Amino acid sequence: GNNFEYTLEASKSLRQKPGDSTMTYLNKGQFYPITLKEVSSSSKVRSVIMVVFAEDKSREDQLRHWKYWHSRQHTAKQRCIDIADYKESFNTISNVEEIAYNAISFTWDINDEAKVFISVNCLSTDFSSQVKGLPLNIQIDTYSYNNRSNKPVHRAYCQIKVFCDKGAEQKIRDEERKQMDITVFKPFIDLDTQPVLFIPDVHFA
Structure with a gap:
């Protein structure tokens, strides 16, 4: 079926007031457990895990x-997203x-x-010198095996x-002084919008 659910197992910020959006906090370069599952009331697929700008x-x-980010890295081999x-x-x-x-593809059985x-x-804050910085999302796109559509079937x-x-x-200790295990991915249905993939090129230097 098309009933997918993804989780991220990390610390999630608490909601101060109604209307505040919730953030999941990660340490840079540290591996976090992500699960992908097809939970339908009733077959292989391809999923892409991305780090993308939220701001759109x-x-x-x-x-x-x-x-900018890639130029500030200490190694040209340093990626934005890694898999263990x-x-x-x-x-x-x-x-x-x-x-x-900033993208990793793999196939799995549903x-x-x-x-x-x-x-x-x-x-x-790695995208400008000396501010709040740029909102980031982890995005997951899932394609069928066939991919006749050529678009994601789920995002x-x-x-x-x-x-x-x-x-x-x-930071969460701080938010406790001033005063769950799992973050679930928010699905969306715009299947047309392709996200920008960053492929560093060193041609013409």
Whole structure:
């Protein structure tokens, strides 16, 4: 069927007032457990895990920003999103492909629960010198095997804020002084909007 659910297992901020949106806090470069599942009342598929700008701009602008981040990295080989090599994960997915520095593709069977371990390696402030920074999401697009449509058949996202040096846990401790285990991905039905993939190129330098 088309009944998918994804989770991210990390610390989630608390809602101060009605209308406040909820953020999931991550440490930079640290692997978090993500689950993907097809829970229908009744077969292989392909999912793409992305880190994308939440703000939703022109493509030129999103490219501009990835370029700033990539230039500030200490290694040209440093990616925006990574996936771990756990046999736990190996046993549930296959055909892993790093299609871009901010995207990772893989296939899985819907009769299983796919288990991956994912890290995000960019701070929200890495896109400008000296501010609140840029909102980030983890997005997941899921395609059928056939892909006759060529579009996702299902899409969802999770708002995140990324920290350095175990700063994630410190921030929720802070929000407790002033005063659950799992974040579920928010689905959406715009299947046309393709997200920008950052593929660093070194031609013509």
